[PDB]
Design a protein around this ligand. Sequence first.
Ligand SMILES: Nc1ncnc2c1ncn2[C@@H]1O[C@H](COP(=O)(O)O)[C@@H](O)[C@H]1O
Ligand SMILES: Nc1ncnc2c1ncn2[C@@H]1O[C@H](COP(=O)(O)O)[C@@H](O)[C@H]1O
Lengths: 430, 430
Amino acid sequence: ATGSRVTVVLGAQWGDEGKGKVVDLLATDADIVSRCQGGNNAGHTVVVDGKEYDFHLLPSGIINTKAVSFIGNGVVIHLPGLFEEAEKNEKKGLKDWEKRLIISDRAHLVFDFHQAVDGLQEVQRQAQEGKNIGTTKKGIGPTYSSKAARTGLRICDLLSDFDEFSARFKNLAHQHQSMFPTLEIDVEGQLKRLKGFAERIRPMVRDGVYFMYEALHGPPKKVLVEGANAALLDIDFGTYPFVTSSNCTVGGVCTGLGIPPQNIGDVYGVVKAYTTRVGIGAFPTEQINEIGDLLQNRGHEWGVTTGRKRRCGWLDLMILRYAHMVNGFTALALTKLDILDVLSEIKVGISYKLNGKRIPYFPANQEILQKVEVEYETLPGWKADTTGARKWEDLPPQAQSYVRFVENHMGVAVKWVGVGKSRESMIQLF
Amino acid sequence: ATGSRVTVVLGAQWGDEGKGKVVDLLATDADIVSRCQGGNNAGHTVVVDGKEYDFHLLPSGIINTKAVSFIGNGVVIHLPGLFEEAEKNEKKGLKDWEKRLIISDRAHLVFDFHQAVDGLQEVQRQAQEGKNIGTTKKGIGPTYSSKAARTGLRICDLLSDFDEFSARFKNLAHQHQSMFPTLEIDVEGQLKRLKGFAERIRPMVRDGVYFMYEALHGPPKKVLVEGANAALLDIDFGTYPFVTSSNCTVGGVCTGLGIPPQNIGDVYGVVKAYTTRVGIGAFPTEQINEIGDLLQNRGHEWGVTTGRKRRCGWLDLMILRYAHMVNGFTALALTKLDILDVLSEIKVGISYKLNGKRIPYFPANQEILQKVEVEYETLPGWKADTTGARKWEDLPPQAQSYVRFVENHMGVAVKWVGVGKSRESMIQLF
Ligand SMILES: Nc1ncnc2c1ncn2[C@@H]1O[C@H](COP(=O)(O)O)[C@@H](O)[C@H]1O
Ligand SMILES: Nc1ncnc2c1ncn2[C@@H]1O[C@H](COP(=O)(O)O)[C@@H](O)[C@H]1O
């Protein structure tokens, strides 16, 4: 026919929905697990047999040895970070990864000064308007700006004539230094490492378009696309400008891997039982209080790197329904249900009210979102432990009702109930 | 089910494939005709009853009064140009357009200084490396760079508090002036016009995501997406950096309109009987000679604005097959076949040879593409006039064989044979 269809896992809120958990579960067999958009700031945690992992650039499937890990063209790479990451997991018992990895010759490079400028930009907007993005300061934003301007460099440029490279690498550095003359650049220093990376990389690089084409039109295969960040952090559809700079939405799978929509199959939306956000920006259901401290506590909602806790809030169906409109989820994975085990009552946002009147849709302007009153619906808690559930019957009543509530209001079937952090901690409803 | 599926028209070469011709034909009835990526530099020519049109930002369907013209979020708008355009067609007998148009509150704004910087950037790369992009100098590149950086402004920001707007508009101006301090900006001058535009715009603007969702999940409708630019000009898959700054490929339809892949139906690839390119960059089959002058002449291959002729070359199946891999065309529209009426023999590129050996795939690095030897296949010309054909039988033998050749080597059915410039000048094969 048209070939094999890919299976997509996407974040439906503001990140940290537990995507790594769903990816790792779906990859166990999968022939190919890939990354299509974003940079080394995914923070996809994978727990498998008392062995916790923190992948940021490498596909969450880099574990599975039978499968091949792929990084599409829509991804931005800061080589240093790449190896720094592989080596940290290389110590947790990860070997031979470099043999089952393939990089797309069309992906862009995040240069040291790129991560530099991110910081400047962030601190600049900081001491001027007393408000910044909340960036992870990993140059993703500036790398993408370079990409759009067509001044940034790609994997295929690094492997070609290192002499034509260096020249461009020089000019781009000087350009950025014009945005912030305070920015210093160890030109020949970074160029030095870069070329070392070149030879370290060369064996893994290939043509991505051709690659993915073969896999989808050759003999039947199972391809897994791991979305990064989330729906409301989408450069186009998120709470702009408090968003990342890539299309975390379904479209990015096409633009990032070079495959047509008809080769996209199941698109799973990972939904966390409650809402979190890291960084500046509106958060209608934010709960800066006892409850928010509780969610944040029981759900370990903190920077897996800097220890910075994330803002916590009740589940918000407004952003969820908005996300579905854009991604067209075929099913959902509801995670961290257990986090709600202890609450007597659980609130969930059903709509927004601006001046006593119910708004019709998710507002484009983030500033408006900061003034809405949230209309909640209070639900009965199951006040019990679910960490041991492994089938729909084990979950108590109110628990099941909570799953149905999400299912019903989104109009999308929940295919998975995350009730723990380990692989085994899922419950496949169907 | 999942709703109505959209019909997409995309360029398969380097632009000017005659997309406006296929759009206008497909829109005649269509309920909605939209634009998803790019800015006011589409140059989609529409000929209907001795009345020629040159649309650049307005959908080629803005003509059809029964239908609604839509501009998605992935599009970048330079308001001045918008009205300048509508008024030029307003003089060709276009009225009430402003009532059947709808702008997405999430689309980005191309500011006067943006088009400014484009020029500087172009001339800069000019007198330094003696080689630039070949840009249309309409600020598309800098607007997208701003978008990625999250410093650019959107339609929804212009309509909101003009006081919070102006402030941001000021800082962005000052930032660009740091890239080129030679750049001057009539700050309060442009801000002046802008606000005038605001009120002129307000009635046409809406929420795009909601809008398109309604149309695809409400009662059945026929939606037409008009791709701009082309496959090999794609920021991700084109001959980077000699490309435009948007995803002209199928993915951009999802990212630009906010609709999921399953809502994408027929994706038609417009293919011109020969190849053209405007701007710097590799062009394997370029024919700087008698033939190239002939194609360029008979096919009127020149800037519909500046009179700049486009580079002309034989049809090249390498880029075509590469394009199909990314867009997944369901059918093709082969245009300007008549242009070949007079040739005795017609050559077409089947593959690339680097150092006597046949390359396996379309090279990511544009520099490599500049060194390939083209392997051609010479075909018999029909040496006859086809401008009058209106059915598959009318076309002479070699003509039909030429259509089959394209069909066969791309593995995609040709559903349309453009043999003239007027609406009636098509031949629907099936
Ligand atoms: N994995 C992630 N989970 C949650 N928020 C994220 C994640 N990656 C980026 N963000 C947010 O995206 C915004 C832009 O950050 P950056 O990706 O560094 O451009 C900030 O508000 C970040 O907190
Ligand atoms: N409609 C078009 N047809 C052909 N080439 C185009 C078109 N629009 C842009 N380009 C090319 O795209 C490249 C970048 O130009 P710009 O779109 O101004 O960033 C140049 O090589 C242009 O000639």
